[PDB]
Design an enzyme around this catalytic site. Structure first.
Site, PDB file in Angstrom:
ATOM      1  N   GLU A 190      -5.115  -8.605   0.218  1.00 14.95           N
ATOM      2  CA  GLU A 190      -6.069  -8.276   1.260  1.00 14.95           C
ATOM      3  C   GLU A 190      -7.389  -8.036   0.572  1.00 14.95           C
ATOM      4  OE1 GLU A 190      -4.945  -4.985   3.610  1.00 14.95           O
ATOM      5  OE2 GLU A 190      -2.803  -5.451   3.528  1.00 14.95           O
ATOM      6  N   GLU A 196       0.828  -1.201   0.000  1.00 12.72           N
ATOM      7  CA  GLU A 196       0.000   0.000   0.000  1.00 12.72           C
ATOM      8  C   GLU A 196       0.868   1.258   0.000  1.00 12.72           C
ATOM      9  OE1 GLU A 196      -2.832  -0.412   3.145  1.00 12.72           O
ATOM     10  OE2 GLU A 196      -4.009  -1.847   1.970  1.00 12.72           O
TER      11      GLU A 196
END
Ligand SMILES: [Ca+2]
Ligand SMILES: [Ca+2]
Ligand SMILES: [Ca+2]
Length: 619
Positions: A296, A174
């Site tokens: 995720e 991320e």
């Protein structure tokens, strides 16, 4: 709501050559069996066994190992900002040896086939937000130093007598979320992050060229934001800059069911458009698709962030993971690995300021939410795994009249697994049209209904001894009918799905101006079949999502009811409208005409999803 689900038990559904449920890729958890969190004061003596074996769950992902070690790695004295190679080596020995000694963990290597490892943002990130290694206090010199460390890391902390090297290496977790201004930002460029990935991947490959390396592990792939500026500035740019250096794409795909009272859901058309657009551009730019590691996914529960555990809160995740996983199961050849973001305990994520545990947990202390005490017991997220514990076998053709009922089915010999997943918040009466050519009788249906009852996650089970024609699928619920047949099913029919990409993408929509797409070289490899025209539409709310669509200048019916919800609470609509196109309308080179009554927005992607049936299975 009412829907008819057709189930053709003899028709294997093939796409990208894959037609078996892959639990190692789909029924997974964001864990590594080495993690201490599997041990401790658990309700069972062997949580690993009870969970990973009990529900046949696979692994997995972790980031702490590589991050802690970088944070505490000695600096290369001869090369400031580089991890000292001999200390990577030395520390790797201790890690491998420690692993070799955890003999009782070694069995679970057969569940780690899709081991994903991601570096955390820091201290790997070399950008403006870069911090020094937390322990040893020096800053990575460059993305090359980061990639070299990672390359050395994976060489030294795995293999030999130690833990097998992970299968999917995400460059960095991320990277853009904070630095580029968050999920609603669309102006900031991913250029630096993209160059970061290219440079890191180059350096990893220098140390270890046999690691599949991916990026950019987007926290929130939101392509439509700011008139698709976000797509241009981020995900397109990543394909442009890093495409030829990545082995796979990595995304985090989170439904936001409760963000400021809004229901911002990827599940359904939005996640489909995301894959669609990214695939489409990848096809246009790279000339090929890459697999996705959805390292995720599930839901986040923002409106609950100041609350502890609840079954309902688990539900929000469980509902999201199901609906999202169904989409991933439609594209097995594009999915390297999809991991619901569920940590075993995430004790490392406990919020001491708030006295609240991490939200994304398989386990909770028995006395929660009232007290963070008691033995570790399962959260109701386990019910997902409970529901899916048996699904295996050959994918067979399923179909729903209602695109909000995501259906899949797998036949394991004489066991059938029919999955009905409700994208919508309406209970749906499902008429089951289960067709089986060879009279093979049902000896048993275990109807396993994963749903919300009294704000708790439950699996309601009924058992049947003969075929059932209708089931009630709950709002947002998932049902698996575990069929048992008198004999192994003969799956001698084939639906071969092939996907074809228009010669153009991201087309601005101008009122009353048809957007013309070529979808070419469509192999109609059978005599019977069907096609789905997938229009990725990115438009402001209030703009029409019912264009006049012609395929080869024959008008086709555009569903008013697309896959998934209305997207009302989303910033704008970004979703794939799945338009039934008859096989006989298809030719090799097809034109798709898309004309809206109003301007603005874009036809982000155009994909012809063609199904080639060995026989006339629809009639
Ligand atoms: Ca289907
Ligand atoms: Ca519907
Ligand atoms: Ca719908």
């Amino acid at each position: 709501s009412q829907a008819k689900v057709s189930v053709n038990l003899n028709v294997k559904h093939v796409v990208g050559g894959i037609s078996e449920f892959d639990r190692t890729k789909y029924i997974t958890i964001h864990a590594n069996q080495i993690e201490n969190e599997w041990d401790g004061d658990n309700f069972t003596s062997d949580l690993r066994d009870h969970f990973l074996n009990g529900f046949d769950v696979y692994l997995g992902r972790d980031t702490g190992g590589i991050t802690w070690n970088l944070n505490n790695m000695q600096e290369d004295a001869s090369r400031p900002g580089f991890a000292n190679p001999s200390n990577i080596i030395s520390k790797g020995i201790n890690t491998r040896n420690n692993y070799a000694s955890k003999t009782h963990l070694h069995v679970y290597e057969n569940r780690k086939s899709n081991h994903v490892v991601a570096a955390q943002l820091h201290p790997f990130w070399t950008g403006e937000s870069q911090i020094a290694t937390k322990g040893t206090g020096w800053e990575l010199a460059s993305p090359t130093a980061t990639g070299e460390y990672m390359g050395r890391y994976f060489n030294e902390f795995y293999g030999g007598n130690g833990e097998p090297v992970p299968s999917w290496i995400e460059v960095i977790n991320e990277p853009a979320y904070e630095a580029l201004g968050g999920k609603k930002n669309f102006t900031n460029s991913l250029q630096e992050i993209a160059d970061f990935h290219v440079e890191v991947a180059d350096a990893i490959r220098v140390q270890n060229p046999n690691l599949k390396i991916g990026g950019y592990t987007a926290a929130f792939p939101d392509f439509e934001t700011g008139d698709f500026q976000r797509w241009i500035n981020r995900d397109k740019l990543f394909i442009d800059v890093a495409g030829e250096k990545m082995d796979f794409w990595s995304w985090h795909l989170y439904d936001f069911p409760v963000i400021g009272g809004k229901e911002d859901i990827r599940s359904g058309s939005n996640v489909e458009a995301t894959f669609d657009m990214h695939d489409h551009y990848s096809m246009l730019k790279l000339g090929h698709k890459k697999p996705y590691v959805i390292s995720e996914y599930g839901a986040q529960t923002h409106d609950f962030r100041n609350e502890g555990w609840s079954s309902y809160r688990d539900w929000l995740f469980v509902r999201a993971q199901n609906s999202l996983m169904m989409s991933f199961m439609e594209r097995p050849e594009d999915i390297a690995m999809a991991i619901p973001f569920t940590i075993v305990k995430a004790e490392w994520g406990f919020n001491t300021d708030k006295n609240l545990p991490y939200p994304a947990r398989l386990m909770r202390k028995a006395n929660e939410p009232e007290s963070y005490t008691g033995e570790w017991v399962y959260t109701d997220r386990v019910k997902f795994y409970d529901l899916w514990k048996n699904v295996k076998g050959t994918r067979i053709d399923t179909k729903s009249t209602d695109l909000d009922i995501q259906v899949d089915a797998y036949v394991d010999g004489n066991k059938g697994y029919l999955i009905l997943n409700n994208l919508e918040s309406e209970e749906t009466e499902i008429t089951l049209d289960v067709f089986e050519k060879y009279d093979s009788s049902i000896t048993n249906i275990l109807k396993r209904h994963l749903t919300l009852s009294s704000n708790n996650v439950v699996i309601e089970e009924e058992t049947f001894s003969s075929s059932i024609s209708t089931v009630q699928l709950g709002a947002g619920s998932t049902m698996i009918l575990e069929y048992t047949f008198a004999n192994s099913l003969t799956i001698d029919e084939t639906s071969t799905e092939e996907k074809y990409y228009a010669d153009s993408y991201l087309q601005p929509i101008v009122a009353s101006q048809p957007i013309l797409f070529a979808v070419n070289n469509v192999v109609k490899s059978a005599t019977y079949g069907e096609a789905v025209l997938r229009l990725g539409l990115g438009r402001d709310h209030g703009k029409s999502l019912k264009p006049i669509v012609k395929v080869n200048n024959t008008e086709v019916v555009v569903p008013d009811d697309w896959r998934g919800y209305d997207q009302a609470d989303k910033g704008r609509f970004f979703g794939t409208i799945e338009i039934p196109v008859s096989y006989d309308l298809l030719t090799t080179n097809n034109t798709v005409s898309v004309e809206f009554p109003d301007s603005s927005g874009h036809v982000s992607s155009v994909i012809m999803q063609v199904f080639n049936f060995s026989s006339d299975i629809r009639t």
